[PDB]
Amino acid sequence: SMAPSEKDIEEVSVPGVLAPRDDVRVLKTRIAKLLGTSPDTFPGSQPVSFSKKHLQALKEKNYFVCEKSDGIRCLLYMTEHPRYENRPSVYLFDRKMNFYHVEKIFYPVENDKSGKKYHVDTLLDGELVLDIYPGGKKQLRYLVFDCLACDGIVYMSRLLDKRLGIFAKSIQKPLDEYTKTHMRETAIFPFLTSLKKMELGHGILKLFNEVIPRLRHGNDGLIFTCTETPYVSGTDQSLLKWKPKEMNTIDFMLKLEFAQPEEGDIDYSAMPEFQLGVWEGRNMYSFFAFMYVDEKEWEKLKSFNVPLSERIVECYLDDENRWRFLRFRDDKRDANHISTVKSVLQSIEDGVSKEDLLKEMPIIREAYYNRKK
Numbered sequence: 331s332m333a334p335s336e337k338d339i340e341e342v343s344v345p346g347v348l349a350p351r352d353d354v355r356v357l358k359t360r361i362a363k364l365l366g367t368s369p370d371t372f373p374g375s376q377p378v379s380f381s382k383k384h385l386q387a388l389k390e391k392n393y394f395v396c397e398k399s400d401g402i403r404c405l406l407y408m409t410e411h412p413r414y415e416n417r418p419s420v421y422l423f424d425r426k427m428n429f430y431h432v433e434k435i436f437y438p439v440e441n442d443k444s445g446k447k448y449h450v451d452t453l454l455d456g457e458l459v460l461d462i463y464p465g466g467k468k469q470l471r472y473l474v475f476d477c478l479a480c481d482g483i484v485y486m487s488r489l490l491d492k493r494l495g496i497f498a499k500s501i502q503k504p505l506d507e508y509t510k511t512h513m514r515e516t517a518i519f520p521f522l523t524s525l526k527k528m529e530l531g532h533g534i535l536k537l538f539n540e541v542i543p544r545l546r547h548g549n550d551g552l553i554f555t556c557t558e559t560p561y562v563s564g565t566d567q568s569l570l571k572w573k574p575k576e577m578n579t580i581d582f583m584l585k586l587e588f589a590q591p592e593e594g595d596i597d598y599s600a601m602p603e604f605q606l607g608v609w610e611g612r613n614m615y616s617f618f619a620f621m622y623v624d625e626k627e628w629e630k631l632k633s634f635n636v637p638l639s640e641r642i643v644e645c646y647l648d649d650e651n652r653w654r655f656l657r658f659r660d661d662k663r664d665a666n667h668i669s670t671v672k673s674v675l676q677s678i679e680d681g682v683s684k685e686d687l688l689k690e691m692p693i694i695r696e697a698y699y700n701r702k703k
Contacts, residue, residue, distance in 0.1 A: 333634035334657040340548065342401045342460045344422055345470055345520035346430035354429045356412040357421060364451055364479055365486070365563075372425045373478065373563045374405050374455055377553060380572040381680035384554075385690050387570070389697050392557040393531030394490070397541060398571060399473060400548025401459035406472065408437060408452040418448040422458065422472075434518050438504040445508075453478040454497065455561075458521065461546035470521035471547070474502070475528075478561060486561035493561065498525055528555070532695035535688060551577055572687065576646045578678050579656060582606035583615050583665045586639040601628050606645065606653055609665040618671070621645060622652035631655070647678065 349357065358369040367373040387393075404422040411417035420437070423429045439447040455476035461469045477497035478486050485493045502525050509516050516522070529537060534552060542549050551573035559568045585605040588596050604621035621643075623631070631638060642659040666674070 346432040349429040353412040377569040377571040379677040394528040398551040406454040408449040451482040459547040473526040
């Protein structure tokens with residue numbers, strides 16, 4: 331068995347080319363003008379970590395819940411090419427404001443038989459995911475979960491119902507019409523676009539047992555979306571991300587220390603100590619914890635026949651709150667910075683266990699129907 335690394339991870343790549351710097355300046359300014367935001371500042375929302383107080387939040391307001399997809403969070407911008415105004419252009423950009431130009435993509439306009447009209451000043455929020463099919467068939471897909479602007483009109487002040495509603499009618503529906511009668515053309519698309527399916531807030535058990543295990547892309551927990559709130563740029567206290575403790579991983583520097591016995595030479599077959607270190611900055615590392623490795627686990631690590639010491643590893647906390655090896659991270663310059671470590675640990679400390687989340691569901695649902703009067 332080869333040593334597990336990030337090379338095992340199904341990697342999602344934005345199917346496009348980085349837009350040139352001068353083009354990006356135009357796009358940022360243009361987006362800022364429409365939204366009323368700041369050009370250099372990402373206008374998308376960011377969720378907060380689910381904590382204990384959020385059990386009451388779900389009890390007080392209408393919420394949707396869906397699977398938190400593994401993939402890349404991207405906003406989609408339909409506009410004209412900054413250099414060629416006669417050229418329709420689609421951009422996907424992330425929270426670091428990296429703009430990618432996507433080609434061979436097509437978003438039809440309603441009731442247009444020419445297929446030459448196009449959308450401008452339209453901004454979607456969603457996630458690019460990679461669905462796996464049998465025979466190594468892979469399908470890139472853009473799951474839409476919000477709309478900031480459609481056809482020149484900003485919908486950020488409206489609630490989720492109107493926001494997703496306008497996207498479904500003006501974008502998805504005509505696209506659905508086109509796709510049904512143009513499967514040959516559709517296959518050229520770098521990715522397929524669809525509205526992300528959501529459940530009522532109290533329906534997480536259905537997600538756990540029926541939806542999630544049938545997914546064709548990576549899952550990373552749950553996202554809760556309030557339906558009584560406007561779109562918020564930046565940190566949105568109404569938008570909640572929930573993750574099991576095992577998914578709240580941290581990258582450490584691993585060091586092995588073998589005990590020198592009183593008499594004779596060191597038995598290197600014997601279990602050493604597994605020290606986990608945290609990056610303090612530059613080249614400074616400090617001791618943080620011991621990694622728990624059982625006897626059979628130690629045999630597997632030896633079976634890898636790769637260097638174990640002085641390496642970045644990804645670790646998680648088990649049921650007994652012991653740090654456990656998950657995979658090597660050869661894609662990292664350093665371990666997680668102490669500030670990042672503290673932040674992840676805080677999400678866990680304030681966290682709600684899966685069990686406690688489920689036991690709260692009846693109360694949540696009950697209050698949902700008592701609001702429905």
